[PDB]
Amino acid sequence: MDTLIGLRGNNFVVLAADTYSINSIIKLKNDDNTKFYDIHGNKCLLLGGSIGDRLQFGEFIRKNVHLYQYQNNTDMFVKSFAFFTRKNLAYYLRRNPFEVNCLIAGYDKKDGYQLYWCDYLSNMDSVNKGAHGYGAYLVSAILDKYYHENLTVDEALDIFKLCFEELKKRFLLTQINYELRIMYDNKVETQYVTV
Amino acid sequence: MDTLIGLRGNNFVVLAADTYSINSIIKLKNDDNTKFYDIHGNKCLLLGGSIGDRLQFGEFIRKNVHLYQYQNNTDMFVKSFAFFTRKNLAYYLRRNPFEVNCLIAGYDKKDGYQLYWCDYLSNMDSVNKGAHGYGAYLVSAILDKYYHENLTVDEALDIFKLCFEELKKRFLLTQINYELRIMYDNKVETQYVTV
Amino acid sequence: SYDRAITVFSPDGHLLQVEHALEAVKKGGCAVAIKSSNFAVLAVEKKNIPKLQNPKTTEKLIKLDEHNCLAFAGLNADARVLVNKTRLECQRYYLNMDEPAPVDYIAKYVAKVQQKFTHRGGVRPFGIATLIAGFKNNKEICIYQTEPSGIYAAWKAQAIGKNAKIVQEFLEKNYQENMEQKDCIFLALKAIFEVVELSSKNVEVALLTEKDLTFIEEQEINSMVELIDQERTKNN
Amino acid sequence: GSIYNYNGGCVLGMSGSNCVAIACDLRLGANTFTTVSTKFSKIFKMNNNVYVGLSGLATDIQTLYEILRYRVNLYEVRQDAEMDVECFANMLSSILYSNRFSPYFVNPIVVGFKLKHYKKVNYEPYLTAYDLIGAKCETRDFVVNGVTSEQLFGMCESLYVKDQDENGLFETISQCLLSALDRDCISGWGAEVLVLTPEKIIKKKLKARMD
Amino acid sequence: GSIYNYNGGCVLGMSGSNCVAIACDLRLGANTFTTVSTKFSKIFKMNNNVYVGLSGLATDIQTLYEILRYRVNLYEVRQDAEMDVECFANMLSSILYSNRFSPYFVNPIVVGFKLKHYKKVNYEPYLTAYDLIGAKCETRDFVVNGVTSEQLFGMCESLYVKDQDENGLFETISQCLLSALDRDCISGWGAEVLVLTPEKIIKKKLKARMD
Amino acid sequence: TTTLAFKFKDGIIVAVDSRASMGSFISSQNVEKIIEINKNILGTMAGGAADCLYWEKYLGKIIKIYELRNNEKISVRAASTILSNILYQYKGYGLCCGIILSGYDHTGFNMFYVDDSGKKVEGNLFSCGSGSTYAYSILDSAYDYNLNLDQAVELARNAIYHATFRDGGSGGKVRVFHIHKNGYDKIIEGEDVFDLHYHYTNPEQKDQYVM
Amino acid sequence: TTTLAFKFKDGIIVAVDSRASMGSFISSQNVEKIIEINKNILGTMAGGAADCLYWEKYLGKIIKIYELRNNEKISVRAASTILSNILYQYKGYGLCCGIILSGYDHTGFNMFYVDDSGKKVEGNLFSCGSGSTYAYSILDSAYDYNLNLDQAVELARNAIYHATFRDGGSGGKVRVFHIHKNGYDKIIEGEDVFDLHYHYTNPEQKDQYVM
Amino acid sequence: TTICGLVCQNAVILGADTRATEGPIVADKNCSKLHYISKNIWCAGAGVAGDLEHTTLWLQHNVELHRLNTNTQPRVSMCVSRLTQELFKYQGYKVCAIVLGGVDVNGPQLYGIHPHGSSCLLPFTALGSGSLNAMAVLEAKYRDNMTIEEGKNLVCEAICAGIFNDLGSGGNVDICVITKDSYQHIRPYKEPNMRLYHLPHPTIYPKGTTPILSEKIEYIK
Numbered sequence A, B: 001m002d003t004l005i006g007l008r009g010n011n012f013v014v015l016a017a018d019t020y021s022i023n024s025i026i027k028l029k030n031d032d033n034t035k036f037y038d039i040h041g042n043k044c045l046l047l048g049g050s051i052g053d054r055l056q057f058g059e060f061i062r063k064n065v066h067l068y069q070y071q072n073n074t075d076m077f078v079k080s081f082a083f084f085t086r087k088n089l090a091y092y093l094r095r096n097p098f099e100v101n102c103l104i105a106g107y108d109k110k111d112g113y114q115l116y117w118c119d120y121l122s123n124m125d126s127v128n129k130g131a132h133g134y135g136a137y138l139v140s141a142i143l144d145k146y147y148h149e150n151l152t153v154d155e156a157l158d159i160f161k162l163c164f165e166e167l168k169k170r171f172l173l174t175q176i177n178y179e180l181r182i183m184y185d186n187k188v189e190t191q192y193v194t195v
Numbered sequence C: 001s002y003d004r005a006i007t008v009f010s011p012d013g014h015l016l017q018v019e020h021a022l023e024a025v026k027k028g029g030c031a032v033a034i035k036s037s038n039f040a041v042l043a044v045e046k047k048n049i050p051k052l053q054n055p056k057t058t059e060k061l062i063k064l065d066e067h068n069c070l071a072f073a074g075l076n077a078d079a080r081v082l083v084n085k086t087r088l089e090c091q092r093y094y095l096n097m098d099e100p101a102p103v104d105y106i107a108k109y110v111a112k113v114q115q116k117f118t119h120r121g122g123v124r125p126f127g128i129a130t131l132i133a134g135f136k137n138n139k140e141i142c143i144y145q146t147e148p149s150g151i152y153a154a155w156k157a158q159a160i161g162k163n164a165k166i167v168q169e170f171l172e173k174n175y176q177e178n179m180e181q182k183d184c185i186f187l188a189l190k191a192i193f194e195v196v197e198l199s200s201k202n203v204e205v206a207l208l209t210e211k212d213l214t215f216i217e218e219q220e221i222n223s224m225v226e227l228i229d230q231e232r233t234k235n236n
Numbered sequence D, E: 001g002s003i004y005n006y007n008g009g010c011v012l013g014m015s016g017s018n019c020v021a022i023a024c025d026l027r028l029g030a031n032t033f034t035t036v037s038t039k040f041s042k043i044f045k046m047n048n049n050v051y052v053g054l055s056g057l058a059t060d061i062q063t064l065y066e067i068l069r070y071r072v073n074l075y076e077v078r079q080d081a082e083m084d085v086e087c088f089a090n091m092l093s094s095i096l097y098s099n100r101f102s103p104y105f106v107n108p109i110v111v112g113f114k115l116k117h118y119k120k121v122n123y124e125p126y127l128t129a130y131d132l133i134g135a136k137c138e139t140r141d142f143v144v145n146g147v148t149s150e151q152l153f154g155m156c157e158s159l160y161v162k163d164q165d166e167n168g169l170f171e172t173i174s175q176c177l178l179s180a181l182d183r184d185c186i187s188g189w190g191a192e193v194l195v196l197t198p199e200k201i202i203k204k205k206l207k208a209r210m211d
Numbered sequence F, G: 001t002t003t004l005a006f007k008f009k010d011g012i013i014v015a016v017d018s019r020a021s022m023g024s025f026i027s028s029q030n031v032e033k034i035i036e037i038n039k040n041i042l043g044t045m046a047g048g049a050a051d052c053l054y055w056e057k058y059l060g061k062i063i064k065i066y067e068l069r070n071n072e073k074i075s076v077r078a079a080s081t082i083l084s085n086i087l088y089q090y091k092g093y094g095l096c097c098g099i100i101l102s103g104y105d106h107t108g109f110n111m112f113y114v115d116d117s118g119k120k121v122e123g124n125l126f127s128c129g130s131g132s133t134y135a136y137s138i139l140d141s142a143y144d145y146n147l148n149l150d151q152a153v154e155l156a157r158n159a160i161y162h163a164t165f166r167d168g169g170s171g172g173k174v175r176v177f178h179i180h181k182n183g184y185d186k187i188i189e190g191e192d193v194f195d196l197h198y199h200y201t202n203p204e205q206k207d208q209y210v211m
Numbered sequence H: 001t002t003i004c005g006l007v008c009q010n011a012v013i014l015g016a017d018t019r020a021t022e023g024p025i026v027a028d029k030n031c032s033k034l035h036y037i038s039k040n041i042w043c044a045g046a047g048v049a050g051d052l053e054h055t056t057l058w059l060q061h062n063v064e065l066h067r068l069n070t071n072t073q074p075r076v077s078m079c080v081s082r083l084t085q086e087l088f089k090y091q092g093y094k095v096c097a098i099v100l101g102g103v104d105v106n107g108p109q110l111y112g113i114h115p116h117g118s119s120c121l122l123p124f125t126a127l128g129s130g131s132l133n134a135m136a137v138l139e140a141k142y143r144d145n146m147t148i149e150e151g152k153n154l155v156c157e158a159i160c161a162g163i164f165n166d167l168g169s170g171g172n173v174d175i176c177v178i179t180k181d182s183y184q185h186i187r188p189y190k191e192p193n194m195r196l197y198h199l200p201h202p203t204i205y206p207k208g209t210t211p212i213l214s215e216k217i218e219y220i221k
Ligand SMILES: */C(=C\S(C)(=O)=O)[C@H](Cc1c[nH]c2ccccc12)NC(=O)[C@H](CC(C)C)NC(=O)[C@H](Cc1c[nH]c2ccccc12)NC(=O)CN1CCOCC1
Pocket: F001, F002, F019, F020, F021, F022, F023, F027, F028, F031, F032, F033, F045, F046, F047, F048, F049, F050, F052, F053, F096, F128, F129, F130, F131, F169
């Protein structure tokens, strides 16, 4: 299973994922890069599930949003992007379902930093902190406890370090390799963390 | 799944196991101690499977062998011990099966250092190297390649280090904590390895 | 099956079968057990035909588990059967509790078995008395004596078998608390030779410590027997 | 039933004297026992006199709300008038039955005002409840829906009082919802209560249990 | 089956002029495709003139061998004589059928010598094959059993030659076994061939494929 | 359910919630999930309430007779072994039991996790129930063996609160007991988590908390 | 099947076995599991032979028309994307395909693993088939990016040999090709693993090797 | 399998094919399907070979024990009772369809017994997978009071029909003629199938052509 984590503050959004590409009982890669889909205009879709469905849905959404932005010479709002993604997932749920969980993060002037949690059933809601996978059970309470308003980026990264340590120590799958996307000060940064 | 590894040389037997006690999606302990059953007279039963069946079968076998040795004022031979274990597992297979894999290691003057491989179906045979679990698929070829006759204890431990590195790197379950039992020079030694 | 009441009450209130089991015990060899600070010493009389019998085969001083040891007097076959029962019960206790069976528990079990055999139809009493030396759950050395009737009691030093009274009197006279290993072995040898003919091949001695039960070497027994003989000659 | 248990959630509606009230739980669940959000409102405003409470599968709630907003907006822009509460109720019934053999897993209620013209206008409380294929129960006192339906039915049968002002109506509906939620594992984590009056709407968040 | 496919394995038996031969594959499998041992012999000696080749589930092979050794040893100690090959074959049939409704998953063959007394003694080759519930096929040329039965049957039908000395018999049986094993995924990894002669037994390990 | 126990420098801290449920209906909010087996052993129960209660009473009877016969207090390891063997004898019947036995004996403080499948794991920190993962995360992020009694009680209370907040099957009251050499104390007899939420997460109480 | 590929300082090393099977029967020992899609791309196939061959030919047709139209060579990434999209369109029909596409383009040496489930993983070292785990272990224990051509060929040959030895579904001959900037060479056209075993594991040939 | 039986004047003639099949593969080319129960009673079996062999052996030895104890001639009715009671006890899970024929005080008797434990006294019968072809022949050609030679020819024709029209039947034709004073078991009786092509010379492998790893020689004493 792929563990996704998302944290929204007043000045940032941090997304984190494990970097494992899994095929049966072997890890194809310890530095997988098929979970994050960065969309021009400070948006990010973090997907978790089977690699095939992940790739198909992520690329479909990214190309559709890029087409929208090119056709309209404008940046799609984060709320529009999240609900467009949810509408597409719901549309395909009853026909040929993608088995993907989504964390939709972004920034726009209208609504600031935004994080949306969506499951494979297309149940979506905007949240301050969210998680997907079997590691959600082990990181959700840490997020709840150590989250507060007016948190800083470095304090959020410390919370994420606690989460990664918990996933290494107590989770059945000893996950040690994580990728983080940080949105703050109208810039997007990539980090790689090993515990 | 519990990965067990066993290597038999002309002068030693090394058994190795992961030290995880697993309950659903969480690791109860990173230093589990319910897999090795040391038996007086240089014998060891390494078990893998559900913790309940593991405990029951291991303690049953250990107490029966100790009773035999006390009643007869003698050390049971390693071959007798292995085939007694196999006969009990086979007896219970068709009534109330223990779902346990066994690596039976030992030393005696008659036959020297001995290693036996037994699966939950009670299919047993003496081997020079063996493995159990889903990590067997990833360590068996390493054992095959780097094993040779007249190997030393330290060369065997190097082979085991290769196996542990492979299980950390490529196995879906990133296993990093292992316990080793080494029988050589009529002494049994315990080691703990972390990768 | 056969369930006749073999052990019954006599008109005077006695169990004659139990008295006869005691007589069988009195017809056996002599066993002495002395306790010390954290170890025990058990000596037992040997009876071998020289040059034809194998000395090692017969064993009146046996080990039940990793920490309990036993000596007995009476009928060897009954002793063997009872000892096998006791070893099985030691391992059953270990399996059921995840801890070794303590000496008090094992002595109680042996006594219970002997009582049951005096009180069940179709069976006769065990004709053996036993001395059980071991450690308790608090790592304390203890010696228990069990009789054919099934009555048990803990002791500091006790002798069973033929002429047990003389050896018990000698022990009561010559026993001291917290002796060293050599002095305790000397005391056990003197007590047993108070009734057994003085000879290094007439006795088998073991020392029980938390680590294990170690049988005393023939040369040490020879030296101690020579010392006892010198003392006797001087006294006379 | 398992599909409704997946998320949980409950909606309630009550009428007073010249006022109505619609209440909901604020939880969003996952796998029937994991709480992922505590601000997932289940009450949606269609126009000034029409509110819909949707409980059930969250994706179906959002889809049905989008469809209903589309239909209501088109109707209102075409007619240059606000949609009637009865017309909206019938349209909701027909939309729900249009998916009869592959339905939305949503159990809605409609709460609002029916406007009657004579000069002045009379506002009449209006409550309807639905099953997932559009079967409609028109009621004058209270309507309930969701996984907490039995608890809400008991509380409303025991405690509902006819013809209450806005304050008494709010107290009654809040007590009913809180007591019913206290007995549900998969509902709660906050309660939202709206009190509709012909001239104003009062929105309140209740201090509820979060366990 | 699938239970036979779990381990694999094959046994073969052939007769010559005053000699017999019994061959087996040496693999031990797991999950039908994992090789754990390459020295798991399937030929067991009951006495000088009786051998049994057991193929099938490894645990059942070991159990049946232990039972057969027990029975043969008791019979021989009681009678003060070696057990006859026909008597052993019938006893094996009865033992296998004693588990008719919960059988051992083993397909055995019996290879040996029938002794006839006149002064001198005549040794007659003896071959039988069984199914798991003791149905017996008595044969004069060759018997096969295991997952490679079809390949072995074809090879033996094409290549068996009647009344061959020990050398020709060994060459024929080894060629049959090797060609049959080359076409089986779950059998092979070495071949063991025993040639029985009234005065000596020749044991050979074949240079076989290990893939 | 959320039950947890952990060793620390002054003994063992045991904590539980008080919620019982059948399906999605909260049957009770004031059950007692910590029981005393004897003077020096506490068991925290999770899973099937009836199974847990019955088998803890059975274990208590066995321990009482053992203590009376042998004039000594039973050890936590022996009690755990007895319970695990009894539960294993019923494997495959549907028992639902997860018990943490924590107590003081001659070998210091001891803690064992016992399951209905016959498991018996010795440890320093355990958590069981549907909130066990959340309790585990909270305990692991802030655990230390050198915590004072007040700090340890606070940590246990916080872990139980977070488990109740995130898990729909846990809630009601939180109980925290302290096992020390001379017995056990009830530091928190029972504390409603309603106050804990507005002490920890929403102290201001000026808006609905957003998870 | 065992197929493997890895990047090293002088290009890409591609290796395969030559065994085909239906069930436990070896259908062939001389199939070709490495194909050339175009001048600078090699695909190694595992799983359903018919599916792999047909869809590789389809991809070759598409690449040929693309290159004819655009007067440029297609990239390994684009070919992998085309193949993965095509395979994904058939998800849920029973296709069995694992293909490693390794080639040289304007962005250097590239290698992608593509599955019938629509996966497309870029990497430096891949292995597929039933022997993939054994090949992976051997490659990981001795892989280095600065291996010479001879060392890399030896490593690939050894990995294939060990996979064939441990896995019953792999065997026959081992083929090793080298992809370099100007095309590809066949270093080992096909080498029987019989000699490989008796050169690696049992050089002495004095007795049966004990695994 | 094709087994059959008929009653002629003062005799009972049983016939069988000799093929045992394990799925589509012939496991035995010359299996014996006619079994001696007593000097005046024989049976032919169809179904699961292990069940048939065990049951026929058990019946034979029980009948011999009964004959020794009663000091009288065995009875086909006794065999029928024992067999049917056993088969019924097992509820058809011993798959044994038996043609049991013998001569006793009541004269020649032929019975068909089915796996569930039903029996029928018949003038002629056929069982097995070739039973329909054998029955066609028997229905076409059977008549009462046939000579022993005519009955032998008819049984051979029926078994040959089964052999050549049923894929589960083959091999030779075995016959048994049972009277009140003797039995004649002809095995084989027809031998109608033989391998038709042989290579010009048998393939003898040259010595040393097989490579070996090791060779241990032990002497039997
Ligand atoms: C923990 C939850 S969990 C998800 O981790 O299993 C609690 C632990 C618990 C609850 N109550 C006690 C009491 C003492 C010790 C521990 C306790 N477990 C539960 O609450 C159970 C969860 C199910 C999924 C196993 N629930 C129960 O056992 C029910 C209790 C109950 C039922 N009616 C009540 C009225 C009043 C108070 C309590 C209860 N009972 C059942 O569901 C069992 N039967 C099954 C047949 O149908 C009737 C209910």
